């Protein structure tokens, strides 16, 4: 009986592919290939944040564009005052294996997670003087890859046990479970309305979900390898995608298909982090070959090279005002350019 | 141009980084090892004098001049390519092989072939522990080892079978900067901490010689 259902699914996916093909008239070529080039972009080393004694695996910027959170394998979560190259807090972690970190938009909470399958939240503004654990969220059967804050009470985490979950910090329960993504969900990005988010996984799929619902609405496809990074456009209608096949793309929510792809012939290392500028014109992509090169989100052009990392870059971040970019590698030193 | 609050914030930062340096000095003298193997391959009883501290299991004990830490990495059913780079700076990888299970022997061989040629494990040495040798030698009369490993000749003795298994395990090694340490041990063998200590100090000496341009 499953043969008829499989045939119906094959007919539906053939119709979907035909619809994407027929909607792909006046395509990515010669629609954005009519404007001026971005030019030459060179960023000098303004800051070199030091203080970790292990590999930095994550980094998130504050919404004041003043404070950073870097969580590393040494069991330490240092909160950095970037304007003066300064340390504000140092939170000893119970489990040193960490693959993600978050910063609440209010500036009050930071999140952390890793191979302990626990998203542990921390409270910075306390009337005791030190950062304490506020709640330990457990219930996944796999490691957590990326956590992003919606407000002071709701967290959404992407984990490697083929699921994503939205929690509430007060009671520590999974309000919404986002089933799908047969591979391991490896990244997550929030649109600038706290309503819809994207999530890539190892099974080469970039689904789009809704927070107020519990199901997908657009399943982008087209990568031939693993995914590692994802990032929305400032409009809220597009997103980028970094992957293990040295291929960073731009996708389109309205068209339900794939816009221009910025890949290079000589590059073979995987992409670990992608990020967008304030206007969305400049895309910064991390690279596993000890480098982090910039591109253009409209045309294919290597506008510049940001070099200086002794090890692999695993976290890249652009502030809300877009004033500075943070680049963190496994050399225990993370850099801020201009 | 610095204010009073700025000065006291700089002092707080100095205290934070001094405590960070103290913690890094304290934690550098701990040997980190990565236990591996098949299901029920003797990982839970590698050392009978260990204290235990889910995603992964961490167990620690102290022997002579060094403090040991073991990562069982059990229950991590996810893809074994996304969190291996977390365990890239381990000094040694303890692989446990159970000679008793003939069905799961090829699973252990496949795992050994996977981990001994990974990009993150090109330099990390491996301390083999051919566990469960007593009942293996007890059952070596009925089973001649050719039911699971063909293309060999021998007297179906314990020594030759152990040598053949060890040779098959070392045949999956393709690296000029790594040495596999093999040590047959019993389930009643209390002498396991000294084997790991000798192997680990030999590994550290070998790594120091490698880094200086020597062997």
């Amino acid at each position, epitope marked *: 009986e499953l043969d008829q259902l499989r045939q119906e699914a094959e007919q539906l996916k053939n119709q979907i592919r035909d619809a994407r093909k027929a909607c792909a008239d006046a395509t990515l070529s010669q629609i954005t290939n009519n404007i001026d080039p971005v030019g030459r972009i060179q960023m000098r080393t303004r800051r070199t944040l030091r203080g970790h004694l292990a590999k930095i695996y994550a980094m998130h910027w504050g919404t004041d564009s003043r404070l950073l959170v870097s969580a590393s394998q040494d069991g330490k979560l240092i909160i950095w*005052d970037s304007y003066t190259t300064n340390k*504000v807090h140092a939170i000893p972690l119970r489990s040193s294996w960490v693959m993600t970190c978050a910063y609440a938009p209010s500036g009050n909470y930071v999140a952390c997670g890793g191979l302990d399958n626990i998203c542990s939240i921390y409270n910075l*503004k306390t009337r*005791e*003087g030190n950062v304490r654990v506020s709640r330990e969220l457990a219930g996944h059967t796999g490691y957590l890859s990326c956590c992003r804050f919606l407000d002071d009470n709701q967290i959404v985490t992407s984990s490697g046990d083929t699921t994503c979950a939205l929690w509430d910090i007060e009671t520590g329960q999974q309000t919404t479970t986002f089933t799908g993504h047969t591979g391991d969900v490896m990244s997550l990005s929030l649109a600038p309305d706290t309503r819809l988010f994207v999530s890539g996984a190892c099974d080469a799929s970039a689904k789009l979900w809704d927070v107020r619902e519990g199901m997908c609405r657009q399943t982008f496809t087209g990568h031939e390898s693993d995914i590692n990074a994802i990032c929305f456009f400032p409009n809220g209608n597009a997103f980028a995608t970094g992957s293990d096949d040295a291929t960073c793309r731009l996708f389109d929510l309205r068209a339900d298909q794939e816009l221009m792809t910025y890949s290079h012939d000589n590059i073979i290392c995987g992409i670990t982090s992608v990020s967008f500028s304030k206007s969305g014109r400049l895309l910064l992509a991390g690279y596993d070959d000890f480098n982090c090169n910039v591109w253009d989100a409209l045309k294919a052009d290597r506008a510049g090279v940001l070099a200086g990392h002794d090890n692999r870059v695993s976290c890249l971040g652009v502030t809300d005002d877009g004033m500075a970019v943070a680049t963190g590698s496994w050399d225990s030193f993370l850099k801020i350019w201009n | *141009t610095l*204010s009073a609050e*700025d000065k006291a914030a700089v002092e707080r930062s100095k205290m934070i980084e001094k405590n960070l340096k103290e913690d890094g000095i304290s934690a550098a003298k701990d040997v980190k090892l990565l236990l591996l193997g098949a299901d029920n391959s003797g990982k839970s009883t590698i050392v009978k004098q260990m204290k235990i501290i889910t995603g992964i299991v961490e167990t620690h004990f102290t022997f002579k001049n060094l403090h040991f830490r073991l990562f069982d990495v059990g229950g991590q059913r996810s893809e074994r390519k996304k969190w291996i780079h977390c365990f890239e700076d381990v000094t040694a990888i303890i692989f446990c092989v159970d000679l008793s299970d003939y069905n799961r022997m090829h699973e252990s061989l496949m795992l050994f072939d996977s981990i001994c040629n990974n990009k993150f494990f090109i330099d990390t040495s491996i301390i083999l522990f051919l566990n469960k040798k007593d009942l293996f030698g007890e059952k070596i009369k009925k089973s001649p080892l050719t039911i699971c490993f063909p293309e060999y000749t021998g007297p179906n003795t314990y020594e030759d079978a152990a040598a053949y298994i060890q040779a098959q395990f070392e045949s999956k090694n393709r690296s000029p900067n790594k040495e596999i340490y093999c040590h047959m041990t019993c389930a009643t063998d209390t002498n396991n901490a000294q084997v790991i200590f000798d192997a680990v100090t030999d590994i550290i000496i070998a790594n120091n010689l490698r880094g200086c341009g020597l062997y």
Partner: single-chain antibody
Amino acid sequence: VQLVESGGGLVQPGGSRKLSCSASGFAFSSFGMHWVRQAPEKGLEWVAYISSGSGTIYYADTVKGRFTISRDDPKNTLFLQMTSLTSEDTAMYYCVRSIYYYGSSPFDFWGQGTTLTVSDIVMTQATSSVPVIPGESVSISCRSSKSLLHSNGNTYLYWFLQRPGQSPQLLIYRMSNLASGVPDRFSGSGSGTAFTLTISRLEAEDVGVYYCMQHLEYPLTFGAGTKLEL
């Protein structure tokens, strides 16, 4: 979180006393604790200071060479050892906690004082007997000998409310930042050497004396005090 200060009492004009205060509820080593005295019918005055981990110890002009401050971090106790007690030291001695990082709120908790009996920047604020009506717009002013703005973009001026029979409580820090637990009616604004606390819709539990503080140059300067009547 509660600070209890013990000791004090009568002393001969030339003797010595060693006041001590203890904390129970917050991490002591992360806070730079202060000593602030209050004459029985006058304003507040800064006395002593010790940093986190005893890394910096500052004294006042009337405190240098005569007093000393120490803290016992393992036992969570702050010590004030005073020598050559004159008759001008007859004051109630307050223990004040303070933390310093980006976004901190220094001088956010005060301990109940110790009555002692022995038998720069200049700031002068407003009037001292203003007729507060319950429910109004009251603009308590302040002044300074300098424009208290640094290159960091932070203007430093603190507002304290002393209820009758109670220790001072922080209301506004930096220049316009509400402290935690302060209701939204309290609001402050100003510029260099011109500061005003605009209290709108005055209510109960607001009568008392209002104080300023500078925190650019470290020897602390208060104001005389503006008192809300009725």
